[PDB]
C-alpha cells in the first residue's frame, strides 16, 4: 500500500509551451505534480501554470528572508541538494541539511536530493555515502517534520557516464533509504515516506520503475515526456 | 457458470520480499470462496514451501522441469502442479513451442496439473500477428495431447507486449485475447473441453484492477508474481 505519488519536473524546450501542455492535460488519479523553476522563471510559472494538481517549487534557496518572501508570494515547495549543488557548487551534506531545516521551519514541503557517484559506487560505498547524506538531514529534524519531507534518490553514477540503472538497482537503492528511516526514525514515518527516483526516466521505463515496491514517483527534467511520466504514476 | 478459478503465484529469484514471510502471510489469510491457490517455486525453495505452506486452499507447483525421472521424483515428493513456457523460458533460455509442448505432454503423462504459458511480444503485436503467434503456440501444445488430457491443463495468457514496454493492457484486450484462445479450443478440440477450460491472465495485475479483469467472461483467474498483493488478487476471484 503506497502513499500518494509525486511527479516533479526540474527545469535546468520552451517553458511557456510546456506549461500550456500541462495546463491542458487531464490527470484523473491521485498524484501531486510539481514544477520546480529557477528564480528568473518563477513569476511566469505561477502566472501561467493553472493546473489544479500542479504546484510550483523554488530551487536551492537557503536564506531565511528569501524563504519568507517565496512563501508570501505563493510558493510552498522547494527542491534542495540536487546532484549539481553538491558536485559543482560545493553544497555539502550539512549545507543541504541546514537548507532543509530552514525550509521546514518556514512551512515548505521539501524535496531533498541525495545520491552517489560512479567513483563512490565502484568502491562499494553506496550505502555509506547515501545513508550519510540523510543522517545529516535527519539530525536537523524532529519526528513531525518528516510529514513535510520527500526524498529523491539521484543515481549520479548513471548520468553522463555510459552506465545504465535497472529498475532492480533503483529498487535496491530505494529500500536502503526506507530501511534506515524505518530503523532510525520509525516504521510509521517510513511507511508514509515518498521516495522519488531522480534518474533517467522516459515513457518506455516509467511504469516498470513505478511498479517497484519502494518507488513513489519521480524527480526529473522538464520535458514534454513528463506527461507520460505522470501517467506512469498509476 | 464459470469453472473453478485459479490464483497462481510465481516466485522469481531476486525479489525484495522474503519467501518465508510471504508463506506466513498466506498461511494466516482467510479465503472463504472456492478458488485453487497455487504457489509456484524454484527447486531450491521447493522443500521449504512444502514444509511451511499449510493453508488448505493452497497447493505448490514446480517450474520448468522437463525430465521424466525428475517429474516422477516431484510427484513422489508431493508436488502435482507445474508451470511451463513462461515468457523468459521462451526469450532467454531458448524454449520453443515444441520444447514447451514436450514438457507439457511429459508433465501430463506423469499425473501433473499443468499451467502452460502463452503470449505474444510487442513486435508480434504491432505487426498484427497476435492470432497466428498465439494460436501457433497452443496448436503446438494441442498436437501432443489427447482430448482427455485437457482435464489436466490450464492456459495462462501472458501479454508479453505489455511487460517492460510502457504499453498497458485494458481488460478489453485481455478479454479479446482470452476469447480467441477459447474459440480455437472449442472449434479444434471441443465445446465441452472449451467450456471447462481455465484461461488465466498472466499480465500486470494489482488490487485496483483484479476485479475488472476477473469479471470478463473468459477470464478464470491469474498467474502473477509472488508478492504480498497476491492476497488481494485471490480476493478478486469472487
Curated annotation (Swiss-Prot), chain B:
Recorded GO MF terms: triose-phosphate isomerase activity
Catalytic activity: D-glyceraldehyde 3-phosphate = dihydroxyacetone phosphate
Matches recorded under InterPro entries: Aldolase_TIM, TIM_sf, TrioseP_Isoase_bac/euk, Triosephosphate_isomerase, Triosephosphate_isomerase_AS
Compartments, as annotated in UniProt: Glycosome
GO biological process terms on file: gluconeogenesis; glyceraldehyde-3-phosphate biosynthetic process; glycerol catabolic process; glycolytic process
Gene Ontology CC annotation, any one: cytosol
Residues that coordinate or bind substrate: 10, 12
EC nos: 5.3.1.1
Xref: NCBIfam families: tim (TIGR00419)
Other comments on record: The enzyme contains a high proportion of positively-charged residues in beta-barrels V and VII (compared to the homologous regions in other triose isomerase sequences). Since 2 clusters of positive charges located at precise distances on the molecular surface are common to 4 glycosomal enzymes, it has been speculated that this might represent a signal for entry into glycosomes.
Assembly information from the UniProt record: Homodimer.
Family according to the record: Belongs to the triosephosphate isomerase family.
Protein's recorded name: Triosephosphate isomerase, glycosomal
Originating organism: Trypanosoma brucei brucei
